[PDB]
Write a protein that binds this ligand. Structure first.
Ligand SMILES: CCCC[C@@H](CN[C@@H](CCCC)C(=O)N[C@@H](CCC(N)=O)C(=O)N[C@@H](CCCNC(N)=[NH2+])C(N)=O)NC(=O)[C@@H](NC(=O)[C@@H](NC(C)=O)[C@@H](C)O)[C@@H](C)CC
Lengths: 99, 99
């Protein structure tokens, strides 16, 4: 679809079999989801944002559906202010910025 | 133009008579630019995301050019690790997400 930016680019996602809401974020390298129970092996990771760094659990090769589109990649689970879908997965669903 | 997401969507902008490189961030409500001595009245403000909040100076009616596209709106100036173009300006250059 074509999504304008007058409102936050929020979309429904399916992860771990659970429906969640996430922000399509072109300014995020990675995908960061709020703390949740996710089937998979993970390893400690640290990421940065506008005000500093936070610790997250890095889960590799996670199957996830974003607005009806499938992607299989790295998902970071931690205390993020908001669920964000980063470029790592947006590239998988063929998302581009256009103006 | 079309901007893929294989790498950070960085564009050249012009603000305060200076040229800078900024990240098109669909996950940012506002525009945060690195510390610069902009002329005029401003309002104290705090903005946050991953890592926490940072103190910024809110400047209104700032004329800015993004990737050759004119825009005018609110610009927050402060200790940001990266120049961020948020939705408030991206909407003005008619930028959309497509997949
Ligand atoms: C979590 C909040 C929603 C998404 C977020 C993403 N912002 C980008 C901007 C900074 C880019 C460096 C970001 O943090 N991206 C991270 C996301 C985490 C991630 N791992 O992908 C990133 O790419 N981090 C890279 C590092 C960037 C490298 N660049 C550099 N160091 N200069 C990483 N860790 O690999 N938005 C924001 O940070 C904006 N906040 C918001 O839009 C809202 N604030 C809140 C708290 O929700 C609004 C109510 O103000 C900021 C800029 C204020 C307007």
């Amino acid at each position: 679809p074509q999504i304008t930016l007058w409102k936050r680019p929020l979309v429904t996602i399916k992860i771990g079999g659970q429906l969640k809401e996430a922000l399509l974020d072109t300014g995020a390298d990675d995908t960061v989801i709020e703390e949740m129970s996710l089937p998979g092996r993970w390893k400690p990771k640290m990421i940065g944002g506008i005000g500093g760094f936070i610790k997250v659990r890095q889960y590799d090769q996670i199957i996830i559906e974003i607005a009806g589109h499938k992607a299989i990649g790295t998902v970071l689970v931690g205390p993020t202010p908001v669920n964000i879908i980063g470029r790592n997965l947006m590239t998988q669903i063929g998302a581009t910025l256009n103006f």
